[PDB]
Coordinates of C-alpha atoms and ligand atoms in Angstrom, one line a residue:
Chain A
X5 CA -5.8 14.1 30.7
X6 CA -5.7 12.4 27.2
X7 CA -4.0 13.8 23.8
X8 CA -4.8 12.5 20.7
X9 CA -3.7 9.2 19.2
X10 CA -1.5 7.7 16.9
X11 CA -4.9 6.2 15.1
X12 CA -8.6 7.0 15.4
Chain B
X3 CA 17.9 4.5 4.0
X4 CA 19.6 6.6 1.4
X5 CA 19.5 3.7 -0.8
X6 CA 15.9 2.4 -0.7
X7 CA 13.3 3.8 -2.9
X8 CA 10.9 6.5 -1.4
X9 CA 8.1 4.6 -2.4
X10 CA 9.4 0.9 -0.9
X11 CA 10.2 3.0 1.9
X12 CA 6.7 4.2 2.6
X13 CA 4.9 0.5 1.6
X14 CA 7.6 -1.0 4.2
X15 CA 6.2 1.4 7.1
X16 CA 2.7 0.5 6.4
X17 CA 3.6 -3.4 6.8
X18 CA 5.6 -2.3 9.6
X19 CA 2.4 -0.4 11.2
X20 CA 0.2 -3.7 11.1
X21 CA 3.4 -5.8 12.4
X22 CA 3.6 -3.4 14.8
X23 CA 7.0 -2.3 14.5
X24 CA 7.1 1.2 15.0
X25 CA 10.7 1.6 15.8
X26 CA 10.7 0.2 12.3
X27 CA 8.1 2.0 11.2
X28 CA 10.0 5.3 12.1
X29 CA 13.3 4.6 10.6
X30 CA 11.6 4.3 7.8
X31 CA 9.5 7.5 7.1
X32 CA 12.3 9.5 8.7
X33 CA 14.5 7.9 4.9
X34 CA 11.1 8.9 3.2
X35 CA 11.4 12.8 5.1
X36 CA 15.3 12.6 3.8
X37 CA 14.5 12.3 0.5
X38 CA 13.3 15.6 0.5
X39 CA 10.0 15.7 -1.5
X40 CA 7.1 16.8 0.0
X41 CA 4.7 14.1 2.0
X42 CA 1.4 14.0 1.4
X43 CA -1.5 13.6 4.1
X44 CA -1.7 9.7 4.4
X45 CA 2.3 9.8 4.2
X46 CA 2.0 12.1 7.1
X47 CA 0.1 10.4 9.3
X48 CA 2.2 7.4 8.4
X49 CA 5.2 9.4 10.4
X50 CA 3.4 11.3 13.4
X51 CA 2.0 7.7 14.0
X52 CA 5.3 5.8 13.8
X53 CA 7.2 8.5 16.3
X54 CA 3.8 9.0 18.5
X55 CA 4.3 5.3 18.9
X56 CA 8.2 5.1 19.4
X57 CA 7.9 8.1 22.1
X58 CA 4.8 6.8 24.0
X59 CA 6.0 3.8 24.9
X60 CA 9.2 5.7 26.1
X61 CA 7.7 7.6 28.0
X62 CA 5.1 5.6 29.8
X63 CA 8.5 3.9 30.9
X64 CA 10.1 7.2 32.2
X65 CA 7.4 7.5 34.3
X66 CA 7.4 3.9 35.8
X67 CA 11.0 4.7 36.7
X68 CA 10.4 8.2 37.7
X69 CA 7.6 6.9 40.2
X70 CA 10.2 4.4 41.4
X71 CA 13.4 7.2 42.0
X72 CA 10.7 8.9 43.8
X73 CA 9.3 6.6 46.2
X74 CA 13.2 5.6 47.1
X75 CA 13.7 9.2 47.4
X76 CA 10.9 9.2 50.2
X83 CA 22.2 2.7 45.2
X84 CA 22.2 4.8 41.7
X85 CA 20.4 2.6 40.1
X86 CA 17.0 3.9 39.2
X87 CA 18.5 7.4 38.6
X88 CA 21.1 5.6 36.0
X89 CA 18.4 3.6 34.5
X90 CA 15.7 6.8 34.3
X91 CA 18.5 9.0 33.2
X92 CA 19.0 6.4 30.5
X93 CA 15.8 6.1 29.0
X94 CA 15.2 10.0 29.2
X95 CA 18.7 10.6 27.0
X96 CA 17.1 8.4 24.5
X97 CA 13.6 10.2 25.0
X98 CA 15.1 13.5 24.2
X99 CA 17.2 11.7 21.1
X100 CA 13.8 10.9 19.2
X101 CA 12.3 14.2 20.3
X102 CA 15.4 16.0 18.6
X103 CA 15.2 13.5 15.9
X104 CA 11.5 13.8 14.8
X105 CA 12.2 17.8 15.8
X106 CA 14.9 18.5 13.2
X107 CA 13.2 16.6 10.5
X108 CA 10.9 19.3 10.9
X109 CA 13.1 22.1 11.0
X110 CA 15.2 20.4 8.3
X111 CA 13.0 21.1 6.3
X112 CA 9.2 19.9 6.5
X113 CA 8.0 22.9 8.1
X114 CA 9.3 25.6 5.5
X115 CA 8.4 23.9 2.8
X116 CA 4.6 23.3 3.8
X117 CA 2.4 25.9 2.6
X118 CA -1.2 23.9 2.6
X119 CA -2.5 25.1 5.7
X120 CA -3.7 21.5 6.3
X121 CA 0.4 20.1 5.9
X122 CA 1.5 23.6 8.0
X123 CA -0.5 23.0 10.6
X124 CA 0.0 19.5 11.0
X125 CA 4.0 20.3 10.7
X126 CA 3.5 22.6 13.5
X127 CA 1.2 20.5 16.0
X128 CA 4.1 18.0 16.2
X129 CA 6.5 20.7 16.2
X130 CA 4.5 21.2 19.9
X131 CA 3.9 17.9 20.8
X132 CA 7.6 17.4 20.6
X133 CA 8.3 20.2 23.0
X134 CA 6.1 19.5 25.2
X135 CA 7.9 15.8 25.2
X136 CA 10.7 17.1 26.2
X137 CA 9.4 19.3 28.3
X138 CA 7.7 16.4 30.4
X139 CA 11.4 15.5 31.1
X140 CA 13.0 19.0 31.7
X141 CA 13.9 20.7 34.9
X142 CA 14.3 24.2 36.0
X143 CA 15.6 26.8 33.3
X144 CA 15.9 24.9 30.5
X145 CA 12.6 23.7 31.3
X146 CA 11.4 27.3 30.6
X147 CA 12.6 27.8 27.3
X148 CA 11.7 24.2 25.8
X149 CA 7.6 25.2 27.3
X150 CA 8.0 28.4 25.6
X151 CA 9.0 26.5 22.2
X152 CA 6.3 24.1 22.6
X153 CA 3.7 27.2 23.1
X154 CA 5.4 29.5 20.3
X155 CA 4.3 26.3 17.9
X156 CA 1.0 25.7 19.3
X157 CA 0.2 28.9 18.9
X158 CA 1.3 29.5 15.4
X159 CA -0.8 26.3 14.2
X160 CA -3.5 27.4 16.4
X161 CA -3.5 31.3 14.5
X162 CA -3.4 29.3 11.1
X163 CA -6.0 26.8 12.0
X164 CA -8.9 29.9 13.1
X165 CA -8.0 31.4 9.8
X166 CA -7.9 28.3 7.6
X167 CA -9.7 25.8 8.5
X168 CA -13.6 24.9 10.1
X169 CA -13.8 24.5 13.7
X170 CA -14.6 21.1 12.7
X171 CA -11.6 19.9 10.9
X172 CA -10.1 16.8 12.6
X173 CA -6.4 18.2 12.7
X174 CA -7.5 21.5 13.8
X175 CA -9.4 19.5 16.9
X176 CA -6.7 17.8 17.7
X177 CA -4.3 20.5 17.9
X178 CA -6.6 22.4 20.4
X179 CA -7.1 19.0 21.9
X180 CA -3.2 18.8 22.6
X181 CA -2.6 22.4 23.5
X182 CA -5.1 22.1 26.2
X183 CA -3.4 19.4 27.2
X184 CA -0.2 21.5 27.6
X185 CA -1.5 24.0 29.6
X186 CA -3.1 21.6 32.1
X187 CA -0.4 19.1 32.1
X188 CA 2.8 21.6 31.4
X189 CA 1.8 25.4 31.4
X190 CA 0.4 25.1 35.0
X191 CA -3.1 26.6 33.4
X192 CA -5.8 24.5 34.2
X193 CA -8.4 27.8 33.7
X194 CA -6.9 28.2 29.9
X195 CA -7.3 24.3 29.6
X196 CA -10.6 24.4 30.4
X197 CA -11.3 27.5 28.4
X198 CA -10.1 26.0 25.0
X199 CA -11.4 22.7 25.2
X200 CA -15.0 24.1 26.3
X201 CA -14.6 26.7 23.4
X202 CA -13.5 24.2 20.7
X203 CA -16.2 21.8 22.0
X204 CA -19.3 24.3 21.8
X205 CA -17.6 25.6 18.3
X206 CA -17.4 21.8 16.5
X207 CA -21.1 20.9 17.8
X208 CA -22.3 24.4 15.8
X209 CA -20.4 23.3 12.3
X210 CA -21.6 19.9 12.9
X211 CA -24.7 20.0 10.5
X212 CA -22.6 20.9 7.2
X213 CA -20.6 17.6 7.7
X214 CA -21.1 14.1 6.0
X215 CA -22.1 11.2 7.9
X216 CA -18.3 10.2 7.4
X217 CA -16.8 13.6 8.3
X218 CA -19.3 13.8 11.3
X219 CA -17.9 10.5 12.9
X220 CA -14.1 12.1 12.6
X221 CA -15.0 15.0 14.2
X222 CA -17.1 13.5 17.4
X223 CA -14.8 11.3 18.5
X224 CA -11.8 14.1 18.7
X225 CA -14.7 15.9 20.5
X226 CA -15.6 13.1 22.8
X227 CA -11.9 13.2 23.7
X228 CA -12.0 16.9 24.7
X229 CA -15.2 16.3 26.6
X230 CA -13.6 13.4 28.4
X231 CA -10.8 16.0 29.6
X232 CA -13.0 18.5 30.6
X233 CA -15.0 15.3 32.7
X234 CA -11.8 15.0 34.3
X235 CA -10.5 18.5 35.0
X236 CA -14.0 19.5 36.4
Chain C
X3 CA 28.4 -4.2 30.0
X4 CA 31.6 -5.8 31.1
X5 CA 31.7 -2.2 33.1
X6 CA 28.5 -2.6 35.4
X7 CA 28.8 -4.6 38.5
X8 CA 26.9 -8.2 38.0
X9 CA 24.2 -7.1 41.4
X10 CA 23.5 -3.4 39.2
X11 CA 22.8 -5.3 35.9
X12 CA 20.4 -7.8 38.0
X13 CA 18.9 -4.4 39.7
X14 CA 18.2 -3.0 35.9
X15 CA 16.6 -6.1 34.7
X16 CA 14.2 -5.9 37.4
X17 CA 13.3 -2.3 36.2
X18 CA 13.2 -2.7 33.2
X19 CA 10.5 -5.6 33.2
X20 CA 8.4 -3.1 35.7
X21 CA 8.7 -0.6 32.8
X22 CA 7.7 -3.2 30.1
X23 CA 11.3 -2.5 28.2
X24 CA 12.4 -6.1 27.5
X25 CA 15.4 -5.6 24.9
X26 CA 16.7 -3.0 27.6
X27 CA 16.1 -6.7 30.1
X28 CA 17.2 -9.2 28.0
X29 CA 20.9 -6.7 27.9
X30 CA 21.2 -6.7 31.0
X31 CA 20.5 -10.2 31.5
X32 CA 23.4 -11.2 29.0
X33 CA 25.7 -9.0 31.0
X34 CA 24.6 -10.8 33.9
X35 CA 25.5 -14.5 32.4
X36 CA 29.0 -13.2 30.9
X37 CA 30.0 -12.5 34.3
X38 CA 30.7 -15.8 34.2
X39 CA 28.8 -16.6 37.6
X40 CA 26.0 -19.3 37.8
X41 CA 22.7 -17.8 38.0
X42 CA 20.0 -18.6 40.7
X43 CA 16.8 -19.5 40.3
X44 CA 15.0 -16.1 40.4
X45 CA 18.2 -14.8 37.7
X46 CA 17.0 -18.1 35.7
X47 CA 13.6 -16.8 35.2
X48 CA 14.8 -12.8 34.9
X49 CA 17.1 -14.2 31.7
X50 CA 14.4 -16.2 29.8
X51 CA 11.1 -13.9 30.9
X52 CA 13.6 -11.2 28.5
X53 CA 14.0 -13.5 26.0
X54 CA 10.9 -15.1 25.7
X55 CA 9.5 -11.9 25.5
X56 CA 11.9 -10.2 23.0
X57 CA 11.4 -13.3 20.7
X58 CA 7.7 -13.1 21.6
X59 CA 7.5 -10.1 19.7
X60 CA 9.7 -11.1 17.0
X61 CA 7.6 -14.1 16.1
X62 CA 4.6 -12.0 16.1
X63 CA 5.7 -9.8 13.8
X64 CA 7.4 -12.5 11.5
X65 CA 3.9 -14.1 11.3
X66 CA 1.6 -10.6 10.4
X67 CA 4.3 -10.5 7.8
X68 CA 4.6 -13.9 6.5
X69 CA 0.6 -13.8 6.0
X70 CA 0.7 -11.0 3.9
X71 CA 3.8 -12.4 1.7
X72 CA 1.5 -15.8 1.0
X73 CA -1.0 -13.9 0.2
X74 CA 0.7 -11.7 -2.3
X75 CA 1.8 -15.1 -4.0
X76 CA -2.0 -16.8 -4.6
X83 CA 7.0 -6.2 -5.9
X84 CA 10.2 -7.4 -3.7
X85 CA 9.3 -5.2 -0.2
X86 CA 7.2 -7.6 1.8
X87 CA 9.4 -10.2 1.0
X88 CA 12.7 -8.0 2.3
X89 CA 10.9 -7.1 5.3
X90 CA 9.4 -10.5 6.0
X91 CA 13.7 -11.3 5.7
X92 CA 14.6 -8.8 7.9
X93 CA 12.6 -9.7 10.7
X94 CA 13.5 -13.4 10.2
X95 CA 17.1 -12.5 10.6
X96 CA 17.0 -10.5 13.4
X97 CA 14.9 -13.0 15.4
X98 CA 17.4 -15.9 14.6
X99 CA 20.0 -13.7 15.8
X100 CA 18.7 -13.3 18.9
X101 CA 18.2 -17.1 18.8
X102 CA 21.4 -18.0 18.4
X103 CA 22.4 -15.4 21.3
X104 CA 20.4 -17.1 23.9
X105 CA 21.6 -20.4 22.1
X106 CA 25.2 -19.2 22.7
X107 CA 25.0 -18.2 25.9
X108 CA 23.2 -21.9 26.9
X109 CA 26.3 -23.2 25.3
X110 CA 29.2 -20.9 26.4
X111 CA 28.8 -21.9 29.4
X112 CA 25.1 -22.1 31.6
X113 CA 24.6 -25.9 30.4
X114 CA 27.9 -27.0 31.0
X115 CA 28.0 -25.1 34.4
X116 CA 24.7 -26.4 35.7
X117 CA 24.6 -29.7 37.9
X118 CA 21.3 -29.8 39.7
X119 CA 18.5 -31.0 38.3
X120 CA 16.2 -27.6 38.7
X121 CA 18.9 -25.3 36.7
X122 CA 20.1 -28.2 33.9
X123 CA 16.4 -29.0 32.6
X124 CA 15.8 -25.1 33.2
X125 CA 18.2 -24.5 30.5
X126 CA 17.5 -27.4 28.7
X127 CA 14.1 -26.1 28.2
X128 CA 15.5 -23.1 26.6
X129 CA 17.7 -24.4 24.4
X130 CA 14.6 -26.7 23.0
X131 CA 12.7 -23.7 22.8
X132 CA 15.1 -21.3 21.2
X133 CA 15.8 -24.4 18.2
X134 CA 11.8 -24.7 18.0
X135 CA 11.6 -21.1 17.1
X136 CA 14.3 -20.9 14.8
X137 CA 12.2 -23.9 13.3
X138 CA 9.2 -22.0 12.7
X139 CA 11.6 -19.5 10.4
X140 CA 13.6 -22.4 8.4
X141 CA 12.6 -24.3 5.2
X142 CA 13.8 -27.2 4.0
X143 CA 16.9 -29.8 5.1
X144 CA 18.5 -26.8 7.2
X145 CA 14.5 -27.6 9.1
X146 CA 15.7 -31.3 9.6
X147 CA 18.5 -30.2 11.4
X148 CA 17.3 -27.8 13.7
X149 CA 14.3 -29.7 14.3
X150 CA 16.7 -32.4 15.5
X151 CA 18.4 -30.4 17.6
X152 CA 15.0 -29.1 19.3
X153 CA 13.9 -32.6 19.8
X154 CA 17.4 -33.4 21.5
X155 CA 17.4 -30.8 23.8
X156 CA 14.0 -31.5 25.2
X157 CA 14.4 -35.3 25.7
X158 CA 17.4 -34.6 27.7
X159 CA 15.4 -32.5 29.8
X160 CA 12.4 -34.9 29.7
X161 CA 14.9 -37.7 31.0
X162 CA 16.6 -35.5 33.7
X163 CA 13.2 -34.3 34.9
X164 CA 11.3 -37.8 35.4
X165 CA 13.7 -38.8 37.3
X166 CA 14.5 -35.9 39.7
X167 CA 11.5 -33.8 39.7
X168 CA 7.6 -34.9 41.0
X169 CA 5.4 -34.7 38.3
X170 CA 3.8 -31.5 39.6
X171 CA 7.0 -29.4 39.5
X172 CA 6.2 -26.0 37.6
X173 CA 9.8 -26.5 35.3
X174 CA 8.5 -30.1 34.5
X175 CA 5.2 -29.0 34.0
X176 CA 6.4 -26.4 31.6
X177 CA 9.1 -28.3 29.7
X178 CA 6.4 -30.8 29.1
X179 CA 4.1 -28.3 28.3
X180 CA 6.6 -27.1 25.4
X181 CA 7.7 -30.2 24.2
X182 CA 3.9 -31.4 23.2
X183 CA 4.0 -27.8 21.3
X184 CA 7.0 -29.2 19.4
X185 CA 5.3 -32.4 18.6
X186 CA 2.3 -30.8 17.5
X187 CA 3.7 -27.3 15.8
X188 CA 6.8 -28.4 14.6
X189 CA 7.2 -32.4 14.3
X190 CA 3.6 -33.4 12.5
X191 CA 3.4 -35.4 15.7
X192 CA -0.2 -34.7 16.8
X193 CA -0.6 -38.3 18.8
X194 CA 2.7 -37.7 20.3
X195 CA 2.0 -34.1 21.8
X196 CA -1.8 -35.1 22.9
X197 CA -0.5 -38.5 24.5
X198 CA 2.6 -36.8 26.3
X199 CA 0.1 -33.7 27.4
X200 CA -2.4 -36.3 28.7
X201 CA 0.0 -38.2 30.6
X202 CA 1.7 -34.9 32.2
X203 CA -1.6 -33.9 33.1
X204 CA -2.8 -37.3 34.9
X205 CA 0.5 -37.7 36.5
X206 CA 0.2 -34.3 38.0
X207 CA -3.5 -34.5 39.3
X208 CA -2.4 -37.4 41.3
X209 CA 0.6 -35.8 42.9
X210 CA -1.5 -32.5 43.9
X211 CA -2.1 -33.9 47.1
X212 CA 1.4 -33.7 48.7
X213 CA 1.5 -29.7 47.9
X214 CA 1.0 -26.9 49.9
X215 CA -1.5 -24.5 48.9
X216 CA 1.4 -21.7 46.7
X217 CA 2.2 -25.0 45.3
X218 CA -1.0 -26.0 44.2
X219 CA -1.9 -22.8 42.5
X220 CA 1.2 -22.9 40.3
X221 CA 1.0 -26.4 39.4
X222 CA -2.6 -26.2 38.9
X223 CA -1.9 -22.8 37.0
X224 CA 0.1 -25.3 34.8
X225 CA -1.8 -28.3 34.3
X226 CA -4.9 -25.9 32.8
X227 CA -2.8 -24.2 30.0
X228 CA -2.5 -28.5 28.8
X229 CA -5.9 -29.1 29.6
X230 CA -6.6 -26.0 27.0
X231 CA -4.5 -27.3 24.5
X232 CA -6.2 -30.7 24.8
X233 CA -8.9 -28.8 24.3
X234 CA -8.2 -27.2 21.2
X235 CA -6.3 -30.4 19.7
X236 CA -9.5 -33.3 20.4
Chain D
X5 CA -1.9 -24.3 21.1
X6 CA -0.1 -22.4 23.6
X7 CA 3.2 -22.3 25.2
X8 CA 3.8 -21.8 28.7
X9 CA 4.2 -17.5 29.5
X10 CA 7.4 -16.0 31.0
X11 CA 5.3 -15.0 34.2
X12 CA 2.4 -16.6 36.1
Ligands
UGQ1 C1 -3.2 15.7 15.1 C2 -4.2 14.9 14.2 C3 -3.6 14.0 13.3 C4 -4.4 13.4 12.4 C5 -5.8 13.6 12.4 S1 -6.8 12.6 11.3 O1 -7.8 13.5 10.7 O2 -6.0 12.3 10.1 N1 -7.3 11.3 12.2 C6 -6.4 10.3 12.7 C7 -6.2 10.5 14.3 C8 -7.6 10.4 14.9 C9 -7.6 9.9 16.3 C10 -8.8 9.8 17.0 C11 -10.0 10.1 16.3 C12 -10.0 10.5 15.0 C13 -8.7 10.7 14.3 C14 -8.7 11.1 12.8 C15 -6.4 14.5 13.3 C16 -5.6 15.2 14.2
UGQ2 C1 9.7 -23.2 31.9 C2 9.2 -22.7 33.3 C3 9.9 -21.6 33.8 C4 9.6 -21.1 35.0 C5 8.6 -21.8 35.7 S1 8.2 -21.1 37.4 O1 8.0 -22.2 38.3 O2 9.3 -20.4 37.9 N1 6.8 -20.1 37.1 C6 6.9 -19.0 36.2 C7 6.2 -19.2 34.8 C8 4.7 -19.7 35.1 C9 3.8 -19.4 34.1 C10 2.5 -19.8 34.2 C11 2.1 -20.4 35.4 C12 3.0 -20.6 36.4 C13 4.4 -20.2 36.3 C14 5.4 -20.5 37.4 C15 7.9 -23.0 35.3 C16 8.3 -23.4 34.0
CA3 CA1 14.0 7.1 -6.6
CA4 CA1 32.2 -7.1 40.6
CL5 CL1 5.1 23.4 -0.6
CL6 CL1 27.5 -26.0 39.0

């Protein structure tokens, strides 16, 4: 499972 | 960083960011945070991306190490070594966790700045909580749902289902309860509910806006192609 | 880390390159060598892996910033930051350059560990080369050159031509010439002669021996490559 | 041009 990142 | 200028402060973490220096890159927006003004929205991307950076990488170390402990588990080491990296997991967690408290949060009144304030305020707890055993455990996931919850309350009120920050706060908390909360059903839920609610606000965006806002929701659908 | 036993601080280094943390490894490996104890060849390669990578990183950064600050001059913060990076690379320059000094050199009598170090110490001037301007260049360009002809001399007459640290120390000394001493005949003529004397010699290797000298031999064929 | 890498 993947949060969001830093940068799109 | 008491004596640099707020504003050399801020251009040096943006050179930082493209030398990819994010321990730098922190040190310097948490001397911005101390100065005590008010950050606006590019200055606060500039620190969740400089800490986000910083605590990844620790963390996708932890668990290198933690894999190893465990499969020897199956001298001290690996536990010294883990235990090491962890205490200075938790020291940048605490760090990025009392800027907030001290006193980003209770001075953000935008929804767009509180909510934001308050997604980190979770993501931070759920760091930790990553880390945490037994009791204590309990209490830090608690503190990381209290704040998810608060941004998620402002974010149904304030802002459009397709707003990037309020995607990615939903993004994150489903993340928690798969990952932390030991709720895969309330995972599922939220991302499936955010997901179906973006695509229905999608016709009132811009061609820019619209872009934003599908790739946070690719994200969510890539979770739910896993978790299903 | 004069506290941690000499086998624990070679146990961490090993972790900490698993979990990609290579200032944690280059620490340890610093303990390791103020023990005071020669190191092997696998400790050999544990010490400069850190370094080279720590530095690595450094010079990567130094370089983002130093093409930003020349093209600001065609206020004062790139400049300062551009600094600050360049000092904390040459300090960890002259580290390794200390410890070669006080006391691996001096200690090492075979031929594999002396031009091992050797190597470093060429390679730790050439980068603090890069950074300098000016007579304080001459110098340091001198004392690169030095250091790798030493080497050079030890390994021609010790080593086959196909041994991986010959390979490599010739491999960075035709760098030198072309990078650092406007010597582009020099590096292309030493890189063409490494690689001939090699292909000839491939024949009395085992196969693992083959595939790391032939590893070798390609990165000068690509160099050759990009320099004809 | 390239140097040689810390690892094969
Ligand atoms: C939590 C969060 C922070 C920032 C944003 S953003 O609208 O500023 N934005 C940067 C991060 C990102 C990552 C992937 C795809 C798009 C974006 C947009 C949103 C949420
Ligand atoms: C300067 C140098 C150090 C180590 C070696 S090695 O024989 O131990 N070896 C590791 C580095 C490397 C990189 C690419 C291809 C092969 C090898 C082998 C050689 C030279
Ligand atoms: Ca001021
Ligand atoms: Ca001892
Ligand atoms: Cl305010
Ligand atoms: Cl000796």
């Amino acid at each position: 499972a993947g949060s969001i990142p830093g940068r799109r | 960083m008491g004596s640099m200028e707020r504003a050399s402060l801020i251009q040096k973490a943006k050179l930082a960011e493209q030398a990819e220096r994010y321990e730098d890159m922190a040190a310097f927006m948490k001397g911005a945070v101390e100065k005590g003004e008010e950050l606006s929205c590019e200055e606060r991307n500039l620190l969740s991306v400089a800490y986000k950076n910083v605590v990844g990488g620790q963390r996708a170390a932890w668990r290198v190490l933690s894999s190893i402990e465990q499969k020897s588990n199956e001298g001290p080491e690996v536990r010294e070594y883990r235990e090491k990296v962890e205490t200075e997991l938790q020291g940048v967690c605490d760090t990025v966790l009392g800027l907030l408290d001290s006193h980003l949060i209770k001075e953000a009144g935008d929804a767009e700045s509180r909510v934001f304030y308050l997604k980190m305020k979770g993501d931070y707890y759920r760091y930790l909580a990553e880390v945490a055993t037994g009791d204590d455990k309990k209490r830090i996931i608690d503190s990381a749902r209290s704040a998810y919850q608060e941004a998620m309350d402002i974010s149904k009120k304030e802002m459009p289902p397709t707003n990037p920050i309020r995607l990615g706060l939903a993004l994150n908390f489903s993340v928690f309860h798969y990952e932390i909360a030991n709720s895969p059903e309330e995972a599922i839920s939220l991302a499936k509910t955010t997901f179906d609610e973006a695509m229905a606000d999608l016709h009132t965006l811009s061609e820019d806006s619209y872009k934003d806002s599908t790739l946070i929701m690719q994200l969510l659908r890539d979770n739910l192609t896993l978790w299903t």
